[PDB]
Amino acid sequence: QSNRELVVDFLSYKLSQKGYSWSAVKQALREAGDEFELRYRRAFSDLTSQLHITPGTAYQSFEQVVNELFRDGVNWGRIVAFFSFGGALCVESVDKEMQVLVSRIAAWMATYLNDHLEPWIQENGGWDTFVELYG
Amino acid sequence: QSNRELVVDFLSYKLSQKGYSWSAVKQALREAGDEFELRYRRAFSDLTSQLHITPGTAYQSFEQVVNELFRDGVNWGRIVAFFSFGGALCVESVDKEMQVLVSRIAAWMATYLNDHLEPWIQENGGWDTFVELYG
Amino acid sequence: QSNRELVVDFLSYKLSQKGYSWSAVKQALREAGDEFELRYRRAFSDLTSQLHITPGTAYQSFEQVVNELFRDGVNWGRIVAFFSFGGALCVESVDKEMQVLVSRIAAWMATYLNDHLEPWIQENGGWDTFVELYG
Amino acid sequence: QSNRELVVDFLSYKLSQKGYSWSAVKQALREAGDEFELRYRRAFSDLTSQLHITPGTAYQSFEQVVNELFRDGVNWGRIVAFFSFGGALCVESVDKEMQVLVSRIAAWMATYLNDHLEPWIQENGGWDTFVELYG
Amino acid sequence: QSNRELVVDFLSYKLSQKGYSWSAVKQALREAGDEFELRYRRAFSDLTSQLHITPGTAYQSFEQVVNELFRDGVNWGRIVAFFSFGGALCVESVDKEMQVLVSRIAAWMATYLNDHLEPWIQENGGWDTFVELYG
Amino acid sequence: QSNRELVVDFLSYKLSQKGYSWSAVKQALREAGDEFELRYRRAFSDLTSQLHITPGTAYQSFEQVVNELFRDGVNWGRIVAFFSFGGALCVESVDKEMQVLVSRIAAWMATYLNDHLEPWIQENGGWDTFVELYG
């Protein structure tokens, strides 16, 4: 349904809100999500220290947890809580996954520099010499 | 060495340059990288369609490729090409990995909505009803 | 049901058809799949550039996409399109996953040779010497 | 060096030899590898039941093992044993990884058929009806 | 439901039973599981050599297999067989995943020692010297 | 070298010490490790909140970090710190990886029970009925 467009709008809203860049009733949902987060996020991290996705997370785990959100009934408030929870999950996941990805590539580059390139750089006057030439 | 601080500066420069947000001689390197990219990136994607990292990429593959960059000697130009290559690798990797991550979480949420929540939403007047109440 | 035997037959048919080796109504399905592919695959890659599986693809993503294949109704033609889509997905996935796997092992071997073995090989007359002896 | 072309030739030789399809001194190496395998593979699986790669295998593990192959010296025979070992590793890895990949996609398809498609198929005369029409 | 508490109890029972440490009707289920395992596990490994999880196993594969356990009907015996199967799956998965994890970290440490530390250790009298000092 | 036997002994010592079960100078190293941990682990978690391995951690990251342990020289104390660090890394990694693995399998089982089995269980008197029969 348009449920996915709803989800996508909420997720990109929350992501851009926390300062992540990559380049209808949706409004009411954005605002209710904000309101919820402003009221309840201290009230949700003391037993909610889960935070993070692993690349091998199954949908069934997600389902079980959110199931305990809806165990004794669906109202609009817990739907909002659901969206907010998904958004927090998203923000955290991309945060840490981006840390590890960039860290991996940076580590690789540092390694290659230190093995194959630093000798030459030392026998040619170091980076100083560089900024002289291609400065 | 300070090689890693160099690498990190270049990577965050290139990432923020392509519009990715998450919240010395470094200058000469930034500029030489830019210059290189402005001169050679059409000249590098016709046999350079590799682009992407897999979560199971080994450093040895990276090493072999960059090795073919330095096969017959190290000069400053190919060092710059090395940094630029690493930056392109980074940008592409985070781009696509972020697409798949966010897509996964969004798919999960859409699924849960459509299985456990949409019935109730239909028996309570739909999202219209929602924007009436928590509007 | 026998749905899985159907699926498996179609997948191995399509894989062996594209030249991949590893060592009923099924016929009508093979032929309809072929026919479909002969009619529509230029008509499916301009907005269908997805191609590839990641080891961390969820069933929910697959479900959402194929859902947009069946959004306004099931007929036999879109069932055939479904099978063909699955087969294309399979072929592409194994193609690229095999590239990266073999590339990883090959890179490892090249590395080990170049670190631990090439010295000795150079102090014993090189591979020429080898083909003299164990030739 | 040309070490990688050596490795690649040996790997594709061994893979095509075991019947896997995807579409110099190399000869002496192919033959010595064959000879080795014909002499020693019963002599190598009783304490060599390792077989398989995981997507998260490090080069360091590979290095340690092959290190125990070369612990007290490099001769041509153990170089050949090295290539043969790498080839066996490759063949096994692609074998099992292909099993799990194809099995995953097939399982997905079976699932989707059984949830979204089989009802309709039952209300339209089943696959028999299909082979009548698009036969 | 309390189905998950059931599952969790059975899994931790079976894990602690095989000697894995990490720090109601449940009883009847534990005992029936034991009884089942004592009667049928030779009768289940000749065509049941699957054993292992990959980090990229989908729930759909699990579902298909267990589906063939329940193909022609649910009775209590096959429910017990289901729990026992899940427990075996668990034990095997953690066994092998723990082997590979610990092996990876150990390999890393061995590598670092042999590259950065062993020189110094040799120029300072070796580990003997160590047990003299911090003994 | 025997460096790996050293590493393995230390790792299994530390793991069994924290209560994990799976079924020379080594002593001086065990004791020095213990001593170190008793003196410094409050002094190491305020800027050392890293803890965890991802299945896609490269050796190069490990190398860079431990490199900052040895930046201005190798003495025996920092070798001990190295072993202790590796052991902590191991314990944490297996802890959390075991949590997620067992949680995944348990979630799968709960799901299957709730979809395919719970209906039948409700039409046959529930688990009470079970403990009557196979009690």
Numbering used by the authors:
A (entry chain A), B (entry chain A), C (entry chain A), D (entry chain A), E (entry chain A), F (entry chain A): 3 to 25, 85 to 196
Task: Give sentences from the paper.
The Bcl-2 family of proteins is a key apoptotic regulator in response to a wide variety of stimuli perturbing cellular homeostasis. The antiapoptotic Bcl-2 proteins interact with the proapoptotic Bcl-2 family members and prevent the formation of an oligomeric pore in the mitochondrial outer membrane (MOM). In contrast, Bcl-xL primarily resides in the mitochondrial outer membrane with the C-terminal helix embedded at the mitochondrial membrane and induces small, transient alterations of the membrane permeability without affecting consequences for the MOMP12. Apart from modulating MOMP directly, the Bcl-2 family proteins and Bcl-xL in particular regulate the calcium homeostasis through interactions with Voltage Gated Anion Channel (VDAC), a MOM protein.
